Amino acid sequence: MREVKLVTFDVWNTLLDLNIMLDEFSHQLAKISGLHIKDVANAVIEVRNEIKKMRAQASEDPRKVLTGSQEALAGKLKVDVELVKRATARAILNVDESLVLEGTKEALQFVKERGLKTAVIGNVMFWPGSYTRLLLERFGLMEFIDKTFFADEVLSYKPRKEMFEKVLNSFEVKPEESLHIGDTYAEDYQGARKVGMWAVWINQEGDKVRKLEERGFEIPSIANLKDVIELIS
Amino acid sequence: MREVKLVTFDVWNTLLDLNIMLDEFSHQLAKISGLHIKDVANAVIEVRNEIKKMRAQASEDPRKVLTGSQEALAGKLKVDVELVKRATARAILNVDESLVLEGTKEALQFVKERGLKTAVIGNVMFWPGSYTRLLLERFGLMEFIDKTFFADEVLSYKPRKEMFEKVLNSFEVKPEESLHIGDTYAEDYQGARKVGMWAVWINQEGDKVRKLEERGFEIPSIANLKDVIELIS
Numbered sequence: 112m113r114e115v116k117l118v119t120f121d122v123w124n125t126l127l128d129l130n131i132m133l134d135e136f137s138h139q140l141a142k143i144s145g146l147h148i149k150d151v152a153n154a155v156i157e158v159r160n161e162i163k164k165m166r167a168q169a170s171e172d173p174r175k176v177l178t179g180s181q182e183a184l185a186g187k188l189k190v191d192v193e194l195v196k197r198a199t200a201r202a203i204l205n206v207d208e209s210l211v212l213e214g215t216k217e218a219l220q221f222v223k224e225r226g227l228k229t230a231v232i233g234n235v236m237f238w239p240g241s242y243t244r245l246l247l248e249r250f251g252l253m254e255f256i257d258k259t260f261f262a263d264e265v266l267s268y269k270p271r272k273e274m275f276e277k278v279l280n281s282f283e284v285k286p287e288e289s290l291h292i293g294d295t296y297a298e299d300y301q302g303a304r305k306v307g308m309w310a311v312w313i314n315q316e317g318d319k320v321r322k323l324e325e326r327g328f329e330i331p332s333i334a335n336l337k338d339v340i341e342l343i344s
Numbered sequence: 345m346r347e348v349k350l351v352t353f354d355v356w357n358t359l360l361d362l363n364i365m366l367d368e369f370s371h372q373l374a375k376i377s378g379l380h381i382k383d384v385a386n387a388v389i390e391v392r393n394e395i396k397k398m399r400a401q402a403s404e405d406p407r408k409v410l411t412g413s414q415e416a417l418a419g420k421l422k423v424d425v426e427l428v429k430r431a432t433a434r435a436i437l438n439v440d441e442s443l444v445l446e447g448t449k450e451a452l453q454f455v456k457e458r459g460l461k462t463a464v465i466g467n468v469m470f471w472p473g474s475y476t477r478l479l480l481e482r483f484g485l486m487e488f489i490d491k492t493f494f495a496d497e498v499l500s501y502k503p504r505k506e507m508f509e510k511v512l513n514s515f516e517v518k519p520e521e522s523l524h525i526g527d528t529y530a531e532d533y534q535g536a537r538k539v540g541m542w543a544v545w546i547n548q549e550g551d552k553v554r555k556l557e558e559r560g561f562e563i564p565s566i567a568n569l570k571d572v573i574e575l576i577s
């Protein structure tokens with residue numbers, strides 16, 4: 112088979128811890144809005160469930176990949192969307208290194224040491240891709256990332272076809288010469304799989320590396336990415 | 345004369361020091377690129393001026409401004425546009441409160457305690473409007489700003505008439521009940537005045553508060569904003 116030249120990474124729940132970030136955000140939004148933390152925490156889950164359900168079917172207008180979530184949240188809580196934007200800014204300044212998931216920097220180093228190209232393909236919600244890029248840069252991860260592709264900056268989102276192809280084209284590689292790893296089945300796995308790339312789904316509820324189908328695997332943690340990479344090299 | 349209900353604010357060189365930022369940015373960009381700061385500073389200057397001119401020509405695309413400035417800089421230096429994006433994240437991480445211009449907090453506080461609404465109206469270049477919002481938030485200034493209207497988010501730019509009108513329609517006030525202060529004569533001053541608002545041009549080389557004309561003022565720094573405010577009240 113063709114040799115893998117590019118490994119692409121999802122961010123939330125693959126490299127960084129999403130719940131800590133979402134909790135810091137709910138907290139910060141509740142603080143500046145003077146609202147009860149439970150109402151804010153619930154609104155966040157509702158907006159996230161809704162958009163996740165839409166994105167799986169490519170039903171959200173990519174032009175609102177960011178603004179949509181922000182305005183939906185603002186409306187649920189009856190506040191100016193300006194407060195939502197400010198809350199994300201404060202949350203990004205309040206989180207820290209505890210956000211980095213175990214084995215993350217090691218897996219990135221493994222890829223870069225084999226001479227492979229790396230990239231980040233992440234969707235966005237509530238806060239722009241620029242905020243997430245700030246975190247990657249701040250935790251030293253960007254040292255191992257060659258290119259970053261955030262939904263709001265590319266005007267698309269996983270599992271949409273043009274989102275992955277944009278990345279493949281940027282590195283001038285073919286789908287079969289690429290592998291994408293992410294934790295959202297409907298977004299990362301199916302997205303990369305139907306474009307032709309090798310796909311790896313992180314299922315923390317899993318125990319071992321499993322071949323799910325042709326060009327598709329399931330692994331318990333990013334720590335096992337090196338096993339999949341080595342298996343197909 | 346109608347009483348002023350809204351005071352709008354330019355950001356760079358009005359509230360925050362743009363020299364310090366551009367310098368931190370040029371240093372970070374030169375650092376990750378392996379180029380001399382001089383090379384980078386010149387490219388920044390060249391892009392900065394060429395963009396200013398296009399705005400004077402009212403022939404700039406509000407939706408491409410940010411990416412344009414980054415692609416223009418990346419091309420002048422012959423680097424991947426990714427290094428430009430990383431540099432803005434790194435600069436934002438390496439700057440501090442020394443970025444706040446003297447008297448900014450007091451000036452903002454004076455306007456707020458006066459019971460007036462406030463807003464930020466700024467153009468974007470090199471780093472997204474969101475990074476600018478992050479710093480204002482980080483330095484405690486967003487506490488005195490009710491709304492933000494950035495070119496990359498609102499899809500318009502000063503001195504264009506629609507940019508100022510968006511803010512007027514947002515706060516639902518007449519041009520005569522608004523005062524805009526900024527340090528760029530063509531973008532801030534002439535743009536605000538042609539729309540009918542009170543306009544204050546910050547001129548550092550200035551020595552005292554000066555009435556430039558009907559609804560037009562010139563002051564050396566934001567520390568004298570209150571003088572104009574109380575003057576027309």
Ligand SMILES: [Cl-]
Binds near residue numbers: 205
């Ligand atoms: Cl805080």
Ligand SMILES: [Cl-]
Binds near residue numbers: 253254
């Ligand atoms: Cl590096």
Ligand SMILES: [Mg+2]
Binds near residue numbers: 122123232233235
């Ligand atoms: Mg993500």
